[PDB]
């Protein structure tokens, strides 16, 4: 962000999102699956349904 | 650790299942859109960036540039969360851009139109 | 033995492999060799071996599998759901074999060592290289009505290395001698819309994809460059000023824009990757949104045959239908390779000057 | 509700904002708007909203508030403790407005001449446009004795954008035609000490800061080119070789060095960043130590208002006095923008040679 106009010729980066991002939950009463909140969970069906690609990118 | 909760065949409420969690660390550019279900990206074919102005809570305007590839995090459908951005060890240096003295910040957009149609 | 569904990215990888022309398919009477067509039992997507009767991940790539592993199956997934995927894979394989045979034969015609004739062409130009368009892969289903996609493929060893060698050698020679071959189109998105057509080719219409509903059997489309030699405005100096391919695609020694083709077979151009990417690879010009459509009946069948909790826990938010919509929202990225967008931004000769007609592939100078 | 003290870098950022002209102050009457000065109630520093009666942190930029939040207060800080910071920021804004108007005048008079005579004057190398200095900001607080620092600020929107546009335009027209304005100067460190002065200029003194007790009302101090026109050592091509700014500053479109000006308004020079930096922001030429010296009085009120445990735990090792001394040692780097140290090491046409006068700014070949 600037106080004047940022000439698009000047800056070619889309964002600053190429850095480290720390996420920490702020409510220990809600649960997500694959990135969406669920009201109830069935633990037996979680067994054998995750891949490392889908695990490292979890909330 | 109650074994009936962890081996139930029937739905269990979220509060009865939850435990105090631990933080996680990510890097958005290295992340993929297909695997991460909480990311959105403007399609790269745009190639016509536009500059917009936004005010803060006090009343001081700012200028911004959006273009093809700009990534956002889809806030809805997630519990309350805490984000920390750490930009150490990066340059962001261009032919006509010097990172010294530049300001980097979060913005929150609230709109009906889906992000990619922007 | 309980089984669980595969995640979405493995399905996208399956679709990409199918439209590239290589999907490992296991048949009971055949094994892991796909030369003779058969009913598929297992397929490999994203390192996951999945049975097609239950669509449940039954193994991984790490361990060797010789028969179908014994497991608990619901048997509610029929063959007509993925017959489309199998069809696309087999047709792409056949078309790759055809294109390789065409390129090799054209090089062998251009391989002729006639040095004196070569520098006399350099002196004057003209057309000495000519191959009859009735000889372009007659045995293929694309030229013969009789042949069917269930016929055994052409047994070929190391198709990709041979195709790379032939394409690189042809481009080296063509750029070396400043010849004018009739295979390239600078922009392939013009072929389906906006290109002039010859008298025979006015009637034909292009399906832009590979599927059973459309017709996949037709002749060869080439630029009419004979009138170019009959046009008094063109000259060897002018042909080296604007018409020579190096004017537009860049010099093949240092080119980084990929090279396309005319619809030689199946009414589909084939894009050839530039040399600076490390290798030469041939891809069809199908758009990613079309590539995604092949699994719609599969999505519906899964929604019919599997439970809600398992689908939600495997595919993700919104279920399998939600995954289908999300992949349709972002198809150009994940479902389209980069080499399909590396066409040169600006051109000198163009793509629209001479109508494309049914003619012999010829090389002039 | 109970509050706590802010950390040191927040105070440093508050000082930096004040001397950049952008401290956002909320009063009970006018709110966050600063168009007419009121009694401060809260200020923003380091992303924290600190009340000015107890200095305790109440609220942040994340959550929007329209009234001073309810809390337990000391009411021990007075107005004289931060009146100096208030004065500094307000006069910084006033000087920005004055320089903006002056640059607008220069640019509009530049536009009044044609390019053909511009190149012809480049061949000639003489003066082309002259603006009476008695019209230069007639109603400012530096120029008019009837004004004060409590006057309302001139209503300007996107001041910095206009600064950037007019500055780049004026310097591009300068480098087009080898031109030289008299008011441009190579290095302001020499303006503060080392420059000759005219008969009517020797009365002038420099405060080297924005001090309330000092006198900011004065005239325009230009670098009179009468003394250089008195120097015929440079031929016309040599006047291009020496007097052109690009011989010291370099070519403007391809340089990373800053440009400075003589104390045109308020006896305080203006420093502008190079084009390749990213934006041509305006800064004062004030040393970081003089910046830190404004808040000397506040430390005693803090040490007399709060308990020692809170100060020790919040400010750091040694408390407020310790932070003050550590930051005084670290003044050269923390309080100095990166554009102030970036100046041409070698200048063949050093500005030290000739005196400065109060009078008519001019642009010359």
Contact D262, D191 (CB under 8 A): yes
CA–CA separation, B33 and B51 (whole Å): 25
CB contact set of B108 (below 8 Å; sequence gap of 6+): B75
Residue B89's region, left for phi above 0, alpha for psi from -120 to 50, else beta, is left
Q: Is B41 helix (H, G, I), strand (E, B) or coil?
A: strand
> From the candidates D24, D100, D275, D279, which should be mutated to test the interface with A, based on the most A CB atoms within 10 A?
D279
How do D362-364 and D180-181 pair as beta strands?
antiparallel
C50 strand-pairing partners: C43, C57
Q: What angle do CA C250, C254, C256 make, to 5 degrees?
A: 65
Across the beta sheet with C362-364, the strand order is: C127-130, C362-364, C180-181
Chain A partners within 8 Å of B77 (Cβ): 35-37
Query: Which of D75, A3, C209, C252 has its CA nearest to residue B53?
Result: A3
Q: What are phi and psi of B86, to 5 degrees?
A: -130, 110
Q: How far, in Å, CA of C42 to CA of C27, rounded? A: 7
Tell me the CA distances in angstroms from B98 to B15, C292, D3, D65, D85, one per residue in order.
49, 43, 39, 35, 30
Q: Say if CB C220 and CB C133 are below 8 A apart.
A: yes
Taking CA atoms, C167 is separated from C109, C270, C337, in Å, by 14, 12, 20
In the 8-state DSSP scheme, what is residue B111? -
Long-range contacts for C175-179 (Cβ within 8 Å, ≥24 apart)?
Answer: C175/C245, C175/C246, C175/C251, C175/C252, C175/C253, C177/C118, C177/C121, C177/C122, C177/C365, C178/C122, C178/C239, C178/C240, C178/C244, C178/C246, C178/C365, C179/C121, C179/C129, C179/C363, C179/C364, C179/C365
Q: Across the interface, do B33 and C332 touch by the CB < 8 Å criterion? A: no
- Distance, in Å, from the CA atom of D46 to the CA atom of D41, rounded to the nearest integer, reads 17
| Pick from B23, B64, B90: nearest CA to A21 | B23
Gap between the Cα atoms of B73 and B42, Å rounded: 12
Measure CB to CB from residue A35 to each of C7, C313, C317 and give the nearest one: C317
Q: How far, in whole angstroms, is CA D290 from its chain's centroid?
A: 13
Query: Quick count: other Cβ atoms within 10 Å of Cβ C134?
Result: 10
Residues C22, C28, C31, C35, CA torsion sign: negative
Residue C42 and residue B16: Cα distance in Å, rounded? 40
Determine, for residues D338 and B101 on separate chains, whether the beta-carbon distance falls below 8 Å.
yes
Map chain D to HEC letters.
Answer: CCCCCCCHHHHHHHHHHHHHCCCCEEECCCECCCCCCCCCCEEEECCEEEECCCCCECCCCCCCCCCCCCCCCCCCCCHHHCHHHHHHHHHHHHHHHHHHHHHHHHHHHHHCCCHHHHHHHHHHCCEEEECCCCCCCCCCCCCCCCCCCCCCCCCCCCHHHHHHHHHHHHHHHHHHCCCEECCEECCHHHHHCCCCECCCCCCCCCCCCCCCCCCCCCCCEECCCHHHHCCCCCCHHHHHHHHCHHHCCCCHHHCCCCEEECCCCCCCCEEECCHHHCCCCEEECCCHHHHHHHHHHHHHHHHHHCCHHHHHHHHCCCHHHHHHHHHHHCHHHHCCCCCCCCCCCCCCCCHHHCCEEECCCEEEC
Cα separation, C119 vs C163, whole angstroms = 28
D and C adjacent (3 or more CB pairs under 8 angstroms): no
How far apart are the C-alpha atoms of C254 and C256, rounded to whole Å? Answer: 7
CB contact under 8 A, A45 and C2: no
Q: Which residue in chain B is spatially nearest to D279 when comparing CA positions?
A: B97
From which experimental method does this structure derive? Answer: cryo-EM
Q: D357 with D199: CB under 8 angstroms?
A: no
Chosen from B20, B31, B35 to mutate, greatest number of chain A CBs within 10 A:
B35
The DSSP line for C64-126 is ---SPPP--------STTTHHHHHHHHHHHHHHHHHHHHHHHHHHHHT---HHHHHHHHHH--
Q: How many CB atoms lie within 10 A of CB A9?
A: 9
> CA angle, D85 as apex, D81 and D88 as ends, to 5°?
145
b/e sequence D5-43, b meaning 16+ C-beta within 10 Å? bbbbebbbbbbbbbbbbbbbbbbeeeeeebeebeebbbb
Distances (CA, A) of D256 to B103, D251, D348: 20, 10, 18
First to last CA, chain B: 48
φ, ψ for residue B66, nearest 5 deg: -115, 150
Category of A18 on φ-ψ map: left (φ > 0), alpha (ψ -120 to 50) or beta: beta
Closest C-alpha to D254, from D161, D189, D182, D171: D171
Q: Which residues of B touch D276 (CB under 8 A)?
A: 95-96, 98
CB atoms A14 and B69 under 8 Å: yes
Domains of chain C: 1-90+287-336 (3.90.1630.10), 91-286+337-365 (3.90.1320.10)
Q: Is D163 on the interface with A (CB under 8 A)?
A: yes
Helix (H, G, I), strand (E, B) or coil at C302: helix
Torsion of CA D299, D302, D303, D307, to 10 degrees: -150
Query: How many other CB atoms are there within 10 angstroms of residue D281's CB atom?
Result: 20
Nearest to A5 among D22, D161, D281 (CB): D161
First-to-final CA distance of chain D: 67
Say how far apart CA C279 and CA C165 lie, in whole Å.
Answer: 10
Q: What resolution in Å is listed for this PDB structure?
A: 3.7
């Amino acid at each position: 962000i600037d106080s004047a106009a940022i000439t698009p010729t000047n800056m070619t980066q889309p964002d600053v999102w190429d850095a480290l991002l720390t996420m920490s939950p702020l409510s220990a009463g809600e649960v997500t699956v694959k990135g969406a909140v669920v009201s109830e969970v069935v633990p037996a069906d979680l067994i054998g349904s995750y891949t490392p690609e889908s695990l490292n990118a979890s909330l | 650790a109650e074994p009936e909760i962890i081996a139930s065949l029937a739905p269990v409420p979220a509060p009865v299942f939850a435990i105090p969690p631990k933080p996680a660390d990510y890097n958005v550019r290295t992340l993929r859109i297909d695997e991460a279900t909480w990311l959105r990206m403007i399609p790269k074919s745009m190639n016509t960036p536009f500059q917009i102005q936004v005010t803060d809570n006090t009343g001081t305007n700012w200028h911004l540039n959006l273009r093809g590839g700009t990534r956002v995090v889809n806030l809805d459908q997630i519990a309350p969360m805490r984000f920390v951005l750490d930009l150490g060890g990066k340059s962001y240096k261009e032919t006509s851009w010097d990172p010294n003295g530049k300001k980097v910040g979060f913005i929150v957009f609230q709109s009906k139109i889906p992000f990619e149609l922007w | 033995m309980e089984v669980c569904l595969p995640n979405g990215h493995q399905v996208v990888d399956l679709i990409n492999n199918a439209f590239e022309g290589r999907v490992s398919i296991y048949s009971a009477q055949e094994g892991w060799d796909k030369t003779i067509s058969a009913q598929p039992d297992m397929m490999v997507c994203g390192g996951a071996v999945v049975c097609m009767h239950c669509l449940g991940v039954v193994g991984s790539l790490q361990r060797k599998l010789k028969h179908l592993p014994h497991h608990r199956c619901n048997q509610q997934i029929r063959h007509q759901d993925y017959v489309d995927v199998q069809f696309a894979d087999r047709v792409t394989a056949h078309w790759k074999r055809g294109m390789l045979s065409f390129v090799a034969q054209m090089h062998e015609m251009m391989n002729d060592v006639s040095p004196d004739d070569l520098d006399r062409v350099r002196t004057e130009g003209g057309s000495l290289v000519e191959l009859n368009w009735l000889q372009v892969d007659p045995n293929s289903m694309f030229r013969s009505i009789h042949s069917s996609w269930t016929d055994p493929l052409q047994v070929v060893d190391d198709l990709d290395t041979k195709l790379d060698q032939y394409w690189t050698a042809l481009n080296l020679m063509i750029d070396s001698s400043d010849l004018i071959p009739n295979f390239m189109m600078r922009d392939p998105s013009h072929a389906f819309n906006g290109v002039k057509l010859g008298g025979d080719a006015r009637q034909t219409q292009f399906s832009r994809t590979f599927d059973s509903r459309s017709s996949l059997e037709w002749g060869v489309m080439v630029y009419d460059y004979s009138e170019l030699e009959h046009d008094p405005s063109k000259g060897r100096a002018y042909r080296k000023e604007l018409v020579t391919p190096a004017r537009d695609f860049g010099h093949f020694g240092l080119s980084h824009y990929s090279r396309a083709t005319t619809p030689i077979l199946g009414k589909m151009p084939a894009v050839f990757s530039g040399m600076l990417t490390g290798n030469c690879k041939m891809y069809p010009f199908i758009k990613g949104t079309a590539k995604l459509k092949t699994v719609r009946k599969l999505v519906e069948a899964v929604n019919h045959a599997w439970g809600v909790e398992k689908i939600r826990y495997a595919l993700g938010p919104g279920g399998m239908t939600g995954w289908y919509n999300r992949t349709m929202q972002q198809a150009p990225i994940v479902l389209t390779p980069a080499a399909l967008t590396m066409f040169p931004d600006t051109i000198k000769f163009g793509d629209l000057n001479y109508p494309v007609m049914i003619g012999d592939p010829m090389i002039l100078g």
